[PDB]
Structure 1
Amino acid sequence: VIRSKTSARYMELVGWLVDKGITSEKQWIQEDQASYISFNAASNSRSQIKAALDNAGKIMSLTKTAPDYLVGQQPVEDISSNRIYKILELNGYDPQYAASVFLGWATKKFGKRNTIWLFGPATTGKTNIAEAIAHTVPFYGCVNWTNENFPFNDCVDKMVIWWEEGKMTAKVVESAKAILGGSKVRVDQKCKSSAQIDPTPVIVTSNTNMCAVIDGNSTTFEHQQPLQDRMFKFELTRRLDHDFGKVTKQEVKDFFRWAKDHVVEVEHEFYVKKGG
């Protein structure tokens, strides 16, 4: 090893690369401009920063996970400032239930029940929370129903896969089980491309009846029974008004820290009871 000087400063940037998780450039711009000031004061190129960016991305994709980037660092422990807790307490969820549920879902604790399905009206606000969690995660995957043979356009070996609204065709439904039960299987991509899907945590953002899988023009129900043993049904009948979103990263980080500080056992149950 040589160990120069300016390159050592890059090591400090590595800390930032493990501070909030930055993959592209929008999050790096939204973070702070002091990093850009230091980069402009140092060298005005594009080789070393691009190399560091791709190295950090490969490291986060081959070693780092998602919950490791969700553990809070500031011991706040304030349930009053947590605005998303009001939604859980209004929908009828126990404060020491869904917390450990998504803790085990993110850390791959249950193994088989690695899916959380949300049910309710579209006027609630679950889409905003899902988008906020996807933005806070450096490697997020959004299933955009655009192609007939490639629904996972953005899900390119990410950490959390988000299933948008829409029914899937009977061609890889059983393969979706490997993505809905925390298993590893080999799927077919575009043309001359075959990548293995790692057991990644997947949350269904479809507010409609996801159990009614419509096979193009016919609604099927033969896959509803097994899916009840691999996912988690989180239904709610509470409607939200305006000014009840704009969730960032500090709130969810403090919530994750508070949930990790109090470990609560979770039993195997699909239909979540309306208690607490």
Structure 2
Amino acid sequence: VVPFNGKGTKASIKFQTMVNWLCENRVFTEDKWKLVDFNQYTLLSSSHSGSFQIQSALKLAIYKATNLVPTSTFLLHCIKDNKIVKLLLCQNYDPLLVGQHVLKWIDKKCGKKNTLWFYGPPSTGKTNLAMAIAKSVPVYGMVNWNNENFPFNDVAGKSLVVWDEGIIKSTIVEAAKAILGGQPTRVDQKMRPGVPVVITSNGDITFVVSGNTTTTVHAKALKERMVKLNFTVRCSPDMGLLTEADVQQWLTWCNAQSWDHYENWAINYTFDFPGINADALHPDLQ
């Protein structure tokens, strides 16, 4: 399709450059814009025609960073020295395979398996790793911030949805089957792609509370849409916060490795994530 013949003025080209600048520096919120470049914000807020451009540029930047650009490219920029590499080795999970899956999972290339699940005892580092990814993607949203009876508001536009210490109520289970499966909401269909979801919890989430009693009616359907990871070993208190770079170096290194190994397991996506294969451990990871 041939684009239109419209030629813009100086102001329009300046606005387009401003949108590119906002998209490049990951400035998607007013607070972030004030914290980063207060001078330009003060200059723009002087009048109506300046204030409107702020909202327009923010919306266009969000759309460009979410829909028109692959999210994985936002994450890609001594492999053994990375904290995350050691952490997955302790949990007997191959750092390479889990890294490759995240790239496909964030890129909606895993089919119906749109949801990741971290399972283990409390204080094993589940939320620390999960929250590290949420700070690496352009925009993220948490279920906890939403209303108690409307947990899935403002799902469209997010690069990732995080559900920390969550549990599924039978009154809203039908909505969970859609989003966790990646099916678009009916509102999205009417007005016009799914959003990856990550869930961390202490118990078994496949059990659904129904009244004052637990039930297993929906246990079968939720299993196909999810991948389970076991974080059993307690973490030392000195680990601290995981930096966005630690994710960046880990994902970038895993990207360049041979991909054919991941495709073999990708033929039949199992609900359970396979453990470390000692015969396939990379030499640099040792």
Q: TM-score range by the shorter chain?
A: 0.7 to 0.9
Q: Relative to structure 1, is the Cα distance of residues 40 and 185 closer, same or farther in structure 2, using a 3 angstrom cutoff?
A: closer
Distance 2:94 2:231 in 1: 13
Query: 1:8 offset after TM fit, Å?
Result: 4.8
Q: Relative to structure 1, is the Cα distance of residues 205 and 196 closer, same or farther in structure 2, using a 3 angstrom cutoff?
A: farther
Distance 2:114 2:91 in 1: 22
- State the match for 1:191 in structure 2: none
Query: 1:123 offset after TM fit, Å?
Result: 0.5
Q: 245, 252, 257: which one pairs with 1:257?
A: 252
CA contact (8 A) 2:91 2:231 kept: yes
Q: 197, 206, 220: which one pairs with 1:202?
A: 197
**Cα offsets for 1:55-105 (capped at 9, x unmatched):** 212333443453242222xxxxx4144211111111111122111121221
Query: 1:210 offset after TM fit, Å?
Result: 1.1
Distance 1:95 1:257 in 2: 12
Distance 1:83 1:199 in 2: 31
**Cα offsets for 1:158-216 (capped at 9, x unmatched):** 22111232322223423322222222342xxxxxxx44593211111223321222124
Secondary structure, aligned partner of 1:182: coil
Q: Relative to structure 1, is the Cα distance of residues 247 and 28 closer, same or farther in structure 2, using a 3 angstrom cutoff?
A: farther
Secondary structure, aligned partner of 1:250: helix
The alignment's C-alpha RMSD in Å is 2.9
Q: 21, 28, 50: which one pairs with 1:23?
A: 28
Distance 2:228 2:247 in 1: 21
Q: Relative to structure 1, is the Cα distance of residues 133 and 42 closer, same or farther in structure 2, using a 3 angstrom cutoff?
A: same
Gap runs ≥5 in structure 2: 1-6, 278-286
Q: Relative to structure 1, is the Cα distance of residues 10 and 128 closer, same or farther in structure 2, using a 3 angstrom cutoff?
A: farther
Amino acid at match of 1:203: V
Report the more deviating stretch, 250-259 or 232-241: 250-259
CA contact (8 A) 1:140 1:155 kept: no
CA contact (8 A) 2:161 2:195 kept: yes
Amino acid at match of 1:252: V
Amino acid at match of 2:220: Q
> Percent of aligned pairs with the same residue?
36
- State the match for 1:139 in structure 2: 139
CA contact (8 A) 1:140 1:159 kept: yes
Give the number of the structure whose residues are more often helix, by fraction: 2
Distance 2:157 2:213 in 1: 31
**Cα offsets for 1:92-144 (capped at 9, x unmatched):** 11122111121221112221222111001220222123223223323212112
- State the match for 2:4 in structure 1: none
CA contact (8 A) 1:116 1:231 kept: yes
Gap runs ≥5 in structure 1: 73-77, 187-193
Amino acid at match of 2:262: E
Q: Relative to structure 1, is the Cα distance of residues 131 and 38 closer, same or farther in structure 2, using a 3 angstrom cutoff?
A: same
CA contact (8 A) 1:108 1:114 kept: yes
Amino acid at match of 2:200: T
* Alignment of 1:70 onto 2:67: no
Secondary structure, aligned partner of 1:171: helix
Distance 2:34 2:245 in 1: 18
- State the match for 1:271 in structure 2: 272
User: So what's the TM-score if we normalise by structure 1?
Assistant: 0.80
Q: Relative to structure 1, is the Cα distance of residues 67 and 207 closer, same or farther in structure 2, using a 3 angstrom cutoff?
A: farther
Distance 2:221 2:88 in 1: 27
* Alignment of 1:222 onto 2:217: yes
Amino acid at match of 2:273: V
Distance 2:156 2:108 in 1: 20
CA contact (8 A) 1:139 1:159 kept: yes
Distance 2:41 2:148 in 1: 43
**Cα offsets for 1:20-73 (capped at 9, x unmatched):** 53311344456xx4x44466678855343333222212333443453242222x
Secondary structure, aligned partner of 2:24: coil
* Alignment of 1:239 onto 2:234: yes
Q: Relative to structure 1, is the Cα distance of residues 154 and 208 closer, same or farther in structure 2, using a 3 angstrom cutoff?
A: farther
CA contact (8 A) 2:124 2:234 kept: yes
